[PDB]
Coordinates of C-alpha atoms in Angstrom, one line a residue:
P1 CA 6.6 -4.7 -21.3
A2 CA 8.8 -3.7 -18.2
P3 CA 10.7 -7.1 -17.9
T4 CA 12.3 -6.5 -21.3
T5 CA 13.5 -2.8 -21.0
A6 CA 15.4 -1.4 -18.2
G7 CA 14.0 1.7 -16.3
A8 CA 14.9 4.8 -14.6
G9 CA 16.7 2.9 -11.7
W10 CA 16.0 1.4 -8.2
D11 CA 14.5 4.1 -5.9
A12 CA 14.5 6.7 -8.7
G13 CA 11.0 7.9 -7.7
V14 CA 11.9 8.4 -4.1
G15 CA 12.7 12.0 -3.4
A16 CA 12.8 12.7 -7.2
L17 CA 10.6 12.6 -10.3
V18 CA 10.7 9.8 -12.9
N19 CA 10.2 10.2 -16.6
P20 CA 9.2 13.9 -16.7
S21 CA 6.6 15.0 -19.2
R22 CA 3.9 17.5 -20.0
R23 CA 2.4 15.4 -22.9
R24 CA -1.4 15.3 -22.5
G25 CA -3.6 12.3 -23.6
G26 CA -4.2 8.6 -23.2
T27 CA -6.0 6.5 -20.6
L28 CA -4.1 5.8 -17.3
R29 CA -4.9 2.3 -16.4
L30 CA -5.1 1.8 -12.7
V31 CA -5.6 -1.4 -10.5
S32 CA -6.7 -2.1 -7.0
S33 CA -7.6 -5.3 -5.0
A34 CA -10.3 -3.3 -3.4
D35 CA -13.1 -1.1 -4.1
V36 CA -13.2 2.4 -2.7
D37 CA -14.8 2.7 0.6
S38 CA -16.7 5.9 -0.7
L39 CA -16.9 8.3 -3.5
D40 CA -18.5 10.9 -1.1
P41 CA -15.3 12.9 -0.4
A42 CA -16.3 13.2 3.3
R43 CA -16.9 9.7 3.9
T44 CA -13.5 8.1 2.9
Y45 CA -10.9 6.9 5.3
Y46 CA -8.5 5.1 2.8
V47 CA -5.2 6.7 2.2
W48 CA -5.3 5.5 -1.5
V49 CA -8.9 7.1 -1.9
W50 CA -7.5 10.5 -0.5
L51 CA -4.8 10.1 -3.1
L52 CA -7.5 9.5 -5.8
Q53 CA -9.5 12.6 -4.6
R54 CA -6.6 14.7 -5.8
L55 CA -8.0 14.0 -9.3
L56 CA -11.8 14.6 -8.3
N57 CA -11.8 17.5 -5.8
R58 CA -9.9 20.7 -5.1
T59 CA -9.5 22.0 -1.5
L60 CA -8.5 25.3 -0.1
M61 CA -5.0 24.0 0.5
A62 CA -3.4 20.8 -1.0
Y63 CA -0.1 18.9 -0.8
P64 CA 2.1 20.5 -3.6
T65 CA 3.2 18.2 -6.6
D66 CA 6.6 17.8 -5.1
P67 CA 8.8 14.7 -4.3
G68 CA 10.9 16.8 -1.9
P69 CA 10.2 17.9 1.9
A70 CA 8.0 20.9 0.4
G71 CA 5.5 17.9 -0.4
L72 CA 4.8 17.9 3.3
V73 CA 3.8 21.5 3.5
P74 CA 0.1 22.4 2.4
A75 CA 0.1 24.9 -0.5
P76 CA -2.6 27.2 -1.9
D77 CA -5.2 25.4 -4.1
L78 CA -8.5 26.9 -4.1
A79 CA -7.3 29.6 -1.8
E80 CA -5.0 32.3 -3.1
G81 CA -2.7 32.1 -0.2
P82 CA -2.0 30.0 2.8
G83 CA -4.3 30.2 5.8
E84 CA -4.1 33.6 7.6
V85 CA -3.7 33.0 11.3
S86 CA -4.8 35.3 13.9
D87 CA -5.9 35.3 17.5
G88 CA -2.9 33.2 18.6
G89 CA -3.7 30.3 16.3
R90 CA -7.4 30.4 17.0
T91 CA -8.6 32.0 13.8
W92 CA -8.1 31.0 10.4
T93 CA -8.9 33.0 7.3
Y94 CA -8.8 31.9 3.6
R95 CA -9.5 34.0 0.3
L96 CA -11.0 31.8 -2.7
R97 CA -10.0 32.2 -6.2
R98 CA -13.0 33.9 -8.2
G99 CA -14.9 32.4 -11.1
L100 CA -14.2 28.7 -10.3
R101 CA -16.7 26.0 -11.5
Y102 CA -17.8 22.6 -10.7
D103 CA -18.3 19.9 -13.4
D104 CA -21.9 20.9 -13.9
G105 CA -20.8 24.5 -14.7
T106 CA -22.1 26.1 -11.4
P107 CA -20.0 28.3 -9.3
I108 CA -17.7 27.4 -6.4
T109 CA -18.3 29.7 -3.4
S110 CA -17.2 30.0 0.2
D111 CA -20.5 28.7 1.3
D112 CA -19.8 25.4 -0.3
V113 CA -16.4 25.0 1.7
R114 CA -18.6 25.9 4.9
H115 CA -21.1 23.4 3.9
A116 CA -18.4 20.7 3.4
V117 CA -17.1 21.3 6.8
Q118 CA -20.7 21.2 8.2
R119 CA -21.4 18.0 6.6
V120 CA -18.7 16.4 8.6
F121 CA -20.9 17.0 11.7
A122 CA -23.7 15.0 10.4
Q123 CA -22.2 11.6 11.5
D124 CA -25.6 9.8 11.7
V125 CA -25.9 10.4 7.8
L126 CA -22.2 10.8 6.6
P127 CA -20.1 8.4 8.8
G128 CA -16.7 7.3 7.4
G129 CA -14.4 10.1 7.2
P130 CA -12.1 12.2 9.5
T131 CA -13.8 14.1 12.2
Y132 CA -10.9 16.3 13.4
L133 CA -13.0 19.5 12.6
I134 CA -15.7 18.7 15.1
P135 CA -14.0 19.4 18.5
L136 CA -12.4 22.5 16.8
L137 CA -15.5 24.0 15.6
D138 CA -18.3 22.8 17.9
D139 CA -19.7 24.9 20.9
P140 CA -20.2 22.5 23.6
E141 CA -22.7 25.0 25.1
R142 CA -24.6 25.1 21.6
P143 CA -24.0 21.8 19.8
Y144 CA -24.3 22.0 16.0
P145 CA -26.4 19.1 14.7
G146 CA -25.2 19.3 11.1
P147 CA -26.7 20.8 8.0
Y148 CA -29.7 18.5 7.6
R149 CA -31.0 19.0 11.2
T150 CA -30.8 22.7 11.1
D151 CA -30.2 25.5 8.2
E152 CA -28.4 27.8 10.5
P153 CA -24.9 27.9 9.6
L154 CA -22.0 26.6 12.1
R155 CA -21.4 29.8 14.1
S156 CA -17.6 29.2 14.1
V157 CA -17.6 29.4 10.5
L158 CA -17.9 32.8 8.7
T159 CA -18.5 33.7 5.0
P160 CA -18.3 37.5 4.9
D161 CA -18.6 37.2 1.1
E162 CA -18.6 34.4 -1.5
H163 CA -14.9 34.3 -1.7
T164 CA -13.9 34.6 2.1
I165 CA -14.1 32.1 4.7
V166 CA -13.1 32.5 8.4
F167 CA -12.7 29.7 10.9
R168 CA -13.0 30.5 14.6
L169 CA -11.5 27.6 16.4
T170 CA -12.3 26.5 20.0
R171 CA -8.6 26.3 20.8
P172 CA -5.2 27.1 18.9
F173 CA -4.4 24.6 16.2
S174 CA -1.2 25.1 14.4
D175 CA -2.0 22.4 11.7
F176 CA -5.1 23.9 10.3
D177 CA -3.9 24.1 6.7
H178 CA -3.5 20.2 6.8
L179 CA -7.1 19.9 7.8
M180 CA -8.1 22.2 4.8
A181 CA -6.1 19.7 2.5
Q182 CA -8.3 16.9 3.2
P183 CA -11.1 15.7 1.0
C184 CA -13.8 16.1 3.9
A185 CA -13.1 19.8 3.4
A186 CA -13.4 19.8 -0.3
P187 CA -16.4 22.2 -1.3
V188 CA -19.8 20.5 -1.6
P189 CA -22.6 22.9 -2.9
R190 CA -25.8 22.5 -0.7
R191 CA -27.9 22.6 -4.0
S192 CA -26.4 19.1 -5.0
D193 CA -25.9 17.5 -1.7
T194 CA -28.1 14.3 -1.6
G195 CA -26.8 13.4 1.7
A196 CA -26.4 9.7 2.2
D197 CA -26.6 9.3 -1.6
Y198 CA -24.0 11.9 -2.5
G199 CA -21.3 9.2 -3.4
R200 CA -23.8 8.1 -6.3
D201 CA -23.4 11.4 -8.1
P202 CA -20.9 13.8 -6.4
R203 CA -19.9 17.1 -7.6
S204 CA -16.3 17.4 -8.9
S205 CA -14.2 20.6 -8.5
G206 CA -11.0 18.7 -9.7
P207 CA -9.8 18.1 -13.2
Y208 CA -11.8 14.8 -13.4
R209 CA -15.2 13.6 -12.7
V210 CA -16.7 10.2 -12.0
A211 CA -18.0 8.9 -15.4
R212 CA -19.0 5.4 -14.1
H213 CA -18.5 3.3 -10.9
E214 CA -19.5 -0.2 -11.0
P215 CA -19.1 -1.8 -7.2
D216 CA -16.3 -4.2 -6.9
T217 CA -15.5 -3.9 -10.8
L218 CA -14.5 -0.6 -12.1
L219 CA -14.2 3.2 -11.6
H220 CA -13.8 5.3 -14.7
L221 CA -13.0 8.9 -14.6
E222 CA -13.4 11.6 -17.5
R223 CA -12.2 15.1 -17.8
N224 CA -14.1 17.7 -15.9
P225 CA -14.9 20.3 -18.8
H226 CA -15.2 23.3 -16.3
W227 CA -11.9 22.7 -14.5
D228 CA -9.6 25.7 -15.4
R229 CA -6.0 24.6 -15.9
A230 CA -4.9 28.4 -15.5
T231 CA -6.3 28.4 -12.0
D232 CA -4.8 25.2 -10.5
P233 CA -1.2 25.4 -9.4
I234 CA -1.2 21.8 -8.4
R235 CA -2.7 19.5 -10.9
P236 CA -1.2 18.9 -14.7
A237 CA -4.3 16.7 -15.5
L238 CA -2.4 14.9 -18.3
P239 CA -4.4 11.7 -19.2
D240 CA -7.7 12.3 -21.1
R241 CA -9.3 9.3 -19.0
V242 CA -8.4 7.2 -16.0
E243 CA -9.7 3.7 -15.5
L244 CA -9.6 1.8 -12.3
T245 CA -10.0 -2.0 -12.4
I246 CA -11.2 -3.3 -9.2
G247 CA -11.2 -6.5 -7.3
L248 CA -8.2 -8.5 -8.2
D249 CA -6.4 -11.0 -6.0
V250 CA -3.4 -9.3 -4.6
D251 CA -0.7 -11.7 -6.5
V252 CA -2.9 -11.4 -9.8
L253 CA -2.7 -7.8 -9.5
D254 CA 1.1 -7.9 -9.2
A255 CA 1.5 -10.4 -12.2
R256 CA -0.7 -8.3 -14.5
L257 CA 0.9 -5.1 -13.4
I258 CA 4.4 -6.4 -14.0
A259 CA 3.2 -7.8 -17.3
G260 CA 2.0 -4.3 -18.4
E261 CA -1.8 -4.9 -18.4
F262 CA -2.0 -2.1 -15.8
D263 CA 0.0 1.0 -15.5
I264 CA 0.0 1.6 -11.8
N265 CA -1.3 -0.1 -8.6
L266 CA -3.6 2.6 -7.2
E267 CA -4.3 0.8 -4.0
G268 CA -0.6 1.1 -3.1
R269 CA -0.2 -1.7 -0.7
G270 CA 3.1 -2.7 -2.5
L271 CA 4.3 -5.9 -4.2
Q272 CA 3.3 -9.0 -2.3
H273 CA 5.8 -11.7 -1.4
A274 CA 6.0 -13.5 -4.8
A275 CA 6.5 -10.2 -6.8
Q276 CA 8.8 -8.9 -4.1
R277 CA 11.5 -11.7 -4.7
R278 CA 10.7 -11.5 -8.3
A279 CA 11.4 -7.8 -8.8
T280 CA 14.2 -7.4 -6.3
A281 CA 16.2 -10.2 -7.8
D282 CA 15.9 -9.2 -11.4
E283 CA 18.3 -6.2 -12.7
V284 CA 15.7 -5.1 -15.2
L285 CA 12.9 -5.3 -12.8
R286 CA 14.9 -3.5 -9.9
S287 CA 14.9 -0.6 -12.1
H288 CA 11.2 -0.2 -12.3
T289 CA 11.0 -0.5 -8.3
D290 CA 10.7 2.1 -5.7
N291 CA 11.1 1.1 -1.9
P292 CA 10.0 4.1 0.1
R293 CA 9.1 4.5 3.8
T294 CA 5.3 4.6 4.2
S295 CA 5.4 6.7 7.4
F296 CA 3.7 3.9 9.1
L297 CA 4.9 2.8 12.6
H298 CA 4.6 -0.9 13.6
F299 CA 4.6 -1.2 17.4
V300 CA 3.2 -2.9 20.5
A301 CA 1.1 -1.1 22.9
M302 CA 1.1 -2.0 26.8
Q303 CA -2.2 -1.3 28.7
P304 CA -1.8 -0.1 32.3
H305 CA -5.5 -1.0 32.8
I306 CA -4.4 -4.7 32.4
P307 CA -2.5 -5.8 35.5
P308 CA 0.6 -6.2 35.7
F309 CA 1.2 -3.7 32.9
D310 CA 0.1 -0.8 35.4
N311 CA 3.6 -1.2 36.7
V312 CA 6.3 0.8 34.6
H313 CA 9.0 -1.9 35.4
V314 CA 7.0 -4.7 33.9
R315 CA 6.6 -2.4 30.8
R316 CA 10.3 -1.6 30.8
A317 CA 11.1 -5.3 31.3
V318 CA 9.2 -6.1 28.0
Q319 CA 11.1 -3.2 26.1
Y320 CA 14.5 -4.6 27.1
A321 CA 13.6 -8.3 26.4
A322 CA 12.3 -7.5 22.9
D323 CA 14.4 -9.3 20.3
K324 CA 14.3 -6.5 17.7
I325 CA 16.0 -8.7 14.9
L326 CA 13.4 -11.6 15.3
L327 CA 10.5 -9.0 15.4
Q328 CA 11.8 -7.3 12.4
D329 CA 12.2 -10.8 10.7
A330 CA 8.5 -11.5 11.5
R331 CA 7.7 -8.2 9.7
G332 CA 9.6 -9.2 6.5
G333 CA 13.2 -9.2 7.7
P334 CA 16.1 -9.9 7.1
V335 CA 15.9 -7.8 3.8
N336 CA 12.3 -6.5 3.7
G337 CA 11.1 -5.8 7.1
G338 CA 11.1 -2.0 7.1
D339 CA 13.4 0.2 9.2
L340 CA 14.3 -0.6 12.7
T341 CA 13.4 2.1 15.2
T342 CA 13.8 2.7 18.9
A343 CA 11.6 5.7 18.8
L344 CA 8.1 6.9 17.5
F345 CA 8.4 9.8 15.0
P346 CA 9.1 8.9 11.3
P347 CA 12.2 10.7 9.9
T348 CA 9.9 12.9 7.8
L349 CA 8.9 15.0 10.9
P350 CA 10.9 17.9 12.3
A351 CA 10.9 16.5 15.6
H352 CA 12.5 13.3 14.7
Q353 CA 15.4 12.4 17.3
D354 CA 17.8 9.9 18.5
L355 CA 15.9 8.4 21.5
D356 CA 16.7 5.0 22.8
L357 CA 15.8 4.7 26.5
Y358 CA 15.7 0.7 26.6
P359 CA 18.7 -0.6 24.5
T360 CA 18.6 -4.2 23.6
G361 CA 22.2 -4.9 23.8
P362 CA 25.1 -5.0 21.2
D363 CA 23.3 -7.4 18.7
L364 CA 19.8 -5.8 19.2
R365 CA 18.4 -9.2 20.3
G366 CA 17.5 -8.1 23.8
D367 CA 19.1 -7.0 27.2
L368 CA 18.0 -9.8 29.3
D369 CA 20.1 -8.8 32.3
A370 CA 18.2 -5.3 32.3
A371 CA 14.8 -7.0 31.7
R372 CA 15.3 -9.3 34.7
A373 CA 16.4 -6.4 36.9
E374 CA 13.1 -4.5 35.8
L375 CA 11.1 -7.6 36.7
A376 CA 12.6 -7.6 40.0
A377 CA 11.6 -4.0 40.4
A378 CA 8.1 -4.9 39.6
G379 CA 8.0 -7.6 42.4
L380 CA 7.9 -10.2 39.7
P381 CA 11.3 -11.4 39.4
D382 CA 10.4 -14.9 37.8
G383 CA 8.0 -13.4 35.2
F384 CA 4.3 -13.6 34.8
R385 CA 1.6 -14.6 32.5
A386 CA -0.1 -12.4 30.2
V387 CA -2.2 -12.2 26.8
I388 CA -1.1 -10.4 23.6
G389 CA -3.9 -9.3 21.1
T390 CA -3.5 -9.4 17.5
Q391 CA -4.8 -10.2 14.0
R392 CA -4.5 -13.2 11.9
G393 CA -1.6 -12.9 9.3
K394 CA 1.5 -10.6 9.7
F395 CA 0.4 -9.2 13.0
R396 CA 0.1 -12.7 14.3
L397 CA 3.8 -13.6 13.2
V398 CA 4.9 -10.4 15.0
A399 CA 2.8 -11.7 18.1
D400 CA 4.6 -15.0 18.0
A401 CA 8.0 -13.2 17.9
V402 CA 6.8 -11.1 21.0
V403 CA 5.9 -14.6 22.8
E404 CA 9.3 -16.0 21.9
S405 CA 11.2 -12.9 22.9
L406 CA 9.5 -12.5 26.3
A407 CA 9.6 -16.2 27.2
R408 CA 13.4 -15.8 27.8
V409 CA 12.8 -13.9 31.0
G410 CA 9.7 -15.9 32.1
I411 CA 7.1 -13.8 30.7
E412 CA 4.7 -16.5 29.3
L413 CA 2.2 -15.0 26.7
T414 CA -0.6 -16.6 25.1
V415 CA -2.2 -15.0 21.9
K416 CA -5.5 -13.8 21.4
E417 CA -6.5 -13.3 17.8
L418 CA -9.3 -10.7 16.9
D419 CA -11.4 -10.3 13.8
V420 CA -9.2 -8.6 11.0
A421 CA -12.2 -6.3 9.5
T422 CA -13.2 -4.9 12.9
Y423 CA -9.9 -4.9 14.5
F424 CA -9.6 -1.1 14.9
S425 CA -13.2 -0.5 15.6
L426 CA -14.3 -3.4 17.8
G427 CA -11.0 -5.1 18.3
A428 CA -7.9 -3.6 19.7
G429 CA -9.6 -0.1 19.1
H430 CA -12.1 -0.7 21.6
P431 CA -11.5 -0.1 25.2
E432 CA -14.0 -2.6 26.4
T433 CA -12.8 -5.4 24.2
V434 CA -9.3 -4.7 25.6
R435 CA -10.7 -5.1 29.1
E436 CA -13.0 -8.1 28.1
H437 CA -10.1 -10.3 26.9
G438 CA -7.4 -8.8 29.2
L439 CA -5.2 -7.7 26.6
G440 CA -2.1 -6.4 28.2
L441 CA -0.2 -6.1 25.0
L442 CA -1.5 -5.3 21.5
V443 CA 0.2 -5.4 17.9
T444 CA -0.7 -2.7 15.7
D445 CA 0.4 -0.4 12.9
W446 CA -0.2 3.4 12.6
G447 CA 0.0 6.0 10.1
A448 CA -0.8 9.7 10.6
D449 CA -3.8 11.3 8.9
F450 CA -1.7 14.3 8.1
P451 CA 2.1 14.6 8.1
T452 CA 2.9 16.5 11.2
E453 CA 3.9 15.6 14.8
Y454 CA 0.3 16.3 16.1
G455 CA -1.2 14.1 13.2
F456 CA 1.3 11.4 14.2
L457 CA 1.7 11.3 17.9
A458 CA -1.6 12.9 19.6
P459 CA -4.0 10.1 18.4
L460 CA -1.6 7.7 20.1
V461 CA -0.9 9.4 23.5
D462 CA -3.1 12.5 23.9
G463 CA -5.5 11.7 26.9
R464 CA -8.3 13.6 25.3
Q465 CA -8.0 11.4 22.3
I466 CA -9.1 8.3 24.0
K467 CA -12.3 6.9 22.0
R468 CA -14.2 5.0 24.5
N469 CA -16.8 3.7 22.0
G470 CA -14.3 2.3 19.4
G471 CA -11.8 3.6 16.8
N472 CA -9.3 4.2 19.7
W473 CA -5.8 4.8 18.8
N474 CA -4.5 5.5 22.4
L475 CA -4.2 1.9 23.3
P476 CA -2.5 2.3 26.6
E477 CA -5.1 5.0 27.3
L478 CA -2.2 7.1 28.4
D479 CA -3.8 10.5 30.2
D480 CA -0.6 12.2 31.5
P481 CA -1.4 15.9 32.2
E482 CA 2.0 16.8 31.5
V483 CA 2.1 15.2 28.1
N484 CA -1.5 16.8 27.3
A485 CA -0.2 20.2 28.5
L486 CA 3.0 19.9 26.1
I487 CA 0.9 19.0 23.1
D488 CA -1.4 22.0 24.0
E489 CA 1.7 24.3 24.1
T490 CA 2.8 23.1 20.6
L491 CA -0.5 24.0 19.1
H492 CA 0.0 27.6 19.7
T493 CA 3.7 27.8 19.4
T494 CA 4.4 29.9 16.1
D495 CA 8.2 29.1 15.9
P496 CA 8.6 25.9 14.2
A497 CA 11.9 25.0 15.9
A498 CA 10.6 25.6 19.5
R499 CA 7.5 23.4 18.4
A500 CA 9.9 20.8 17.5
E501 CA 11.6 20.9 20.7
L502 CA 8.4 20.6 22.7
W503 CA 7.5 17.5 20.5
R504 CA 10.8 15.8 21.3
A505 CA 9.9 16.3 25.1
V506 CA 6.7 14.8 24.5
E507 CA 8.0 11.7 22.7
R508 CA 10.6 11.2 25.4
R509 CA 8.1 11.3 28.2
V510 CA 5.9 8.8 26.3
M511 CA 9.0 6.5 26.1
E512 CA 9.7 7.1 29.8
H513 CA 6.1 5.7 30.4
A514 CA 7.2 2.7 28.4
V515 CA 3.6 2.1 27.1
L516 CA 4.7 1.9 23.5
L517 CA 7.3 -0.4 22.0
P518 CA 8.5 0.8 18.6
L519 CA 9.5 -1.9 16.1
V520 CA 9.9 -0.6 12.7
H521 CA 9.0 2.2 10.5
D522 CA 7.3 0.4 7.5
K523 CA 8.5 0.2 4.0
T524 CA 6.9 -0.9 0.9
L525 CA 7.9 -1.8 -2.7
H526 CA 6.0 0.1 -5.5
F527 CA 6.4 -1.1 -9.2
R528 CA 6.2 1.5 -12.0
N529 CA 5.8 0.8 -15.5
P530 CA 8.4 2.6 -17.8
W531 CA 5.7 4.4 -20.1
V532 CA 4.0 6.1 -17.1
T533 CA 5.4 9.9 -16.8
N534 CA 6.0 12.0 -13.8
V535 CA 6.0 9.0 -11.2
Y536 CA 7.1 9.9 -7.7
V537 CA 6.4 8.8 -4.3
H538 CA 4.5 11.6 -2.7
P539 CA 6.1 12.3 0.8
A540 CA 2.7 13.1 2.4
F541 CA 1.4 9.7 1.2
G542 CA 4.0 7.2 1.0
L543 CA 2.5 6.4 -2.4
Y544 CA 2.7 7.6 -5.9
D545 CA 1.2 10.9 -6.7
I546 CA -1.4 9.4 -9.2
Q547 CA -2.8 12.8 -10.2
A548 CA 0.8 14.0 -11.4
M549 CA 1.1 11.0 -13.9
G550 CA 0.8 10.9 -17.6
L551 CA 1.4 8.4 -20.5
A552 CA 4.4 8.4 -22.9
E553 CA 3.5 8.9 -26.7

């Protein structure tokens, strides 16, 4: 077992590969506290299921098997090369590898990739996954109702032959290769598409296929006999079998993982408190632990639609009066509370910059003089009363720290807790709920659906991205024409350097608005058993790249 033999070392799997091997064979024993949300590649919105999909389904482009920065750049998978860009970022062409096959022996064609993309449009039948493709491909003058309501193909997607696909976008989109790397764009052959029931028997284009799924119990994967190693530049497919055990209590999971009963935690939410203190204190256990950034941001949003947060000076007062140390401690500090940040972008993104418009004093505990001056500017020199929205648990601890911070300048907050399960769909993520409860501040965390500045920041601040019916991530409902225009400019800017500078201007303007108070960039503790080969934190996921792993002889 792990506690008896020292491993590769603390953080050895962060930016580097642990225990490299090409040895095939064995059963990779994975564990999760939760069942998959879906086995339909189009209907999953769990990061760890996207990660699992790297074993089950290939895509035109895929994140490469690389612990370094190149891991963030989609690489050719089913396509022979990266997306060919024409029409100023509006037209994307891919050329498919020939003779590739699904697990049933049938051919993979460009029609199947179009079909997969078309499926996303059938939100009445296949809800649950990302929908970035819809506005990029839909004609507002001639809406596409999905592939079940019409057999006429999407007019923005051409398949001139069985090995060519052309996407004609409604607007320039610099990040299209990223969209083609998502499981909702993995080919689905229409012949096998059972619609709402697809997850019960999905086709596989990857090295593994579903052998058995028992809800809340297990998921077993076996080799796909028709997957061709010589045609796949991404996947080493080392284990003969992958067995996921599902439904364990989180502390039960950690204990059994550390004991060696499971190889790796697939769900990847990190070690819980008890195992955190155990692993970080023991020299042998430390050697089996990685402490990566997850690329998630923990922040507080302020809503101009809820007075007095319409006033920029109220919002700046809150930023200045934030006790960043106390807030980090609420998040797991002093030693496990992520990485303090005064801006939004994670350091993985090119546009990451030094930006601290509202410094909190020499000890980072708040500039109360500056906060009081801002309150005076708002016509509220003695403070005011407001409500902060949050979840039960860790979010509540953060909310309490906001209450404590702001009370120092006469901002008297009470806390409104919202249901955990629907927090993003019907809680903080629903504009009507925010108004109903008068939630001037909201505690949340956020991770991009793809590792780019657009993926990270646009859902948070782009006026066109306000979701009025729920699932909203632009909590302040910022709709600044200048921010929107800058975002549009990045999307057609070919030069990565010029694009980064534009994104820096976006972030600066957002911070000028003071609608988002950055707290920390989240970190996590992953435990790796020493007999697992090729363990590394994938930079696009903040989780180990399960598909790369094998077992030692």
